[PDB]
Design a protein around this ligand. Sequence first.
Ligand SMILES: O=C(O)C[C@@H]1c2ccccc2C[C@H]1NC(=O)c1cc2cc(F)ccc2[nH]1
Ligand SMILES: O=C(O)C[C@@H]1c2ccccc2C[C@H]1NC(=O)c1cc2cc(F)ccc2[nH]1
Length: 578
Amino acid sequence: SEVAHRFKDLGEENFKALVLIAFAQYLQQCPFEDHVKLVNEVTEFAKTCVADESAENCDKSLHTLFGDKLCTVATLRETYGEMADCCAKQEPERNECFLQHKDDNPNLPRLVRPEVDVMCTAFHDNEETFLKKYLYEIARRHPYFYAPELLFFAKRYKAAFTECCQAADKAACLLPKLDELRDEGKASSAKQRLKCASLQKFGERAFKAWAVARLSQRFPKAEFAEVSKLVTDLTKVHTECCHGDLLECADDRADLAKYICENQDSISSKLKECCEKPLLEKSHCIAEVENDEMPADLPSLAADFVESKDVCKNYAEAKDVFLGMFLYEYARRHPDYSVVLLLRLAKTYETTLEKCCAAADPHECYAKVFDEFKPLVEEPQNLIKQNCELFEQLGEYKFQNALLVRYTKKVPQVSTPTLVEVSRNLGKVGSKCCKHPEAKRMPCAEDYLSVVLNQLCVLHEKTPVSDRVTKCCTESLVNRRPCFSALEVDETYVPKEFNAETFTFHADICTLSEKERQIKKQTALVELVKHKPKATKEQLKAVMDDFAAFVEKCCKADDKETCFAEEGKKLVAASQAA
Ligand SMILES: O=C(O)C[C@@H]1c2ccccc2C[C@H]1NC(=O)c1cc2cc(F)ccc2[nH]1
Ligand SMILES: O=C(O)C[C@@H]1c2ccccc2C[C@H]1NC(=O)c1cc2cc(F)ccc2[nH]1
């Protein structure tokens, strides 16, 4: 009985929280109350199985059990409508369906967060509910969020509230802690979506390719066979989490943590304080530990991968393991390299070994391999140092408008919200990456944009509108940022003439955050660019200066939306002629 095998392995709390995530993530419009109802039933059931694994229903699959339970609520199609299809389906099709129906951008209201004392009061008046609601709200909104990490977050969310409510000033303590979690959570969700993306479209071999490069960057001193082992184990974990098997995800991640911790010596010099931490922390720690030192004096790549006379033999026995070896050997020698690049280098190799083995003479052509890299390597190098001067001039905000305009004109089919969000995240590279020296710049950007461009691809995959976006996304997972960095301004676009409510703001806007304010400013900007893509210089500064500065006028105008209904009409004439 797997349900009992999971229960006993993780325990009731995590079992209960991993379940609630499972559901939250599967029927996303469903109310908190309902899920918790469902979760305790499943809980009720598990205990029996633990108590008697022979009992009536304890042999079914976890999907089966969770699927029947879920569909108790989903069945209504006046409330839901589209998930009730998955209900009439049986396994394994029912699970395929729920996963297909996972909505990366769900039309959901934001929890206007109440004052600090009420949260504190709620936290004490009943925390068990309070904390359940944190898993629920994040899961709902992040249907691919790495669940076993989402628990690690929860514990930390619990800790903040217990510290900060008892503190003299409850707000100055709590608010910074919360916002730190939020950010740390948005990066996590994003990073995790890339893994599910990779796994479910480009197959595991591609995920495998990514981890081996990554783990070997981190664990250079480890053997190759020791890295493949870890890679395989990781893959089964992410496969399982990205397939909705969250319970065995948590278990298998836990096994690996223990495994790593028991062979510390054979894997890394740098895991001492990581592997002394408790359950949940232990895995977050290990995952994000620092790069180990490089084994004294290493040989050249060439000898094995070039100068040797038995490439094709080692290739043709098993090209995957060989290419895995190259991916190992190349990466352990270069922690200063981006992982997308390396994957781009290794692929040149794969293709070139099929070009050269297929000849009568193997050697002559593949001796020239390590020139073919120089241009692939220099392409990312040039783009990053080009944008960074262009950033420190403008600042994170101004520099996001430079992106907005560009990507807007580049791909005007896309929805303004998508454009606004992706370009807002794309320019955040300039903050975290240009800050470094070159020794860590180019890589930093190139890898971050890998995450931010996936966001674009999965948001566009929802409702396709463009021809070119759907290309860069589906053509080759690692060739993405250079693919979007080869799309010129389009000449096909038929622009929508005028939309008067887009550029006329309101008095609700004088009661919201600077971030939200910025996001409004920028939405209007995108949609103005959407009016004239062709001849349009900096001048988009001025009229955006106006739609932003005139806000200052009307906020500090002490009226009942009089000036908004006329002094905004002054500017629609300003944005057409000029
Ligand atoms: O060629 C592909 O697109 C599939 C995968 C890919 C992805 C990027 C760069 C190279 C390659 C080659 C290809 N994967 C592998 O060759 C491969 C990696 C790998 C890692 C291991 F720990 C054990 C065996 C392995 N085989
Ligand atoms: O995969 C994990 O959850 C943790 C992995 C781990 C564990 C111990 C030491 C180092 C590391 C690195 C850490 N994996 C990654 O960073 C990683 C990123 C990433 C992005 C992809 F698009 C596809 C596969 C990927 N793996």
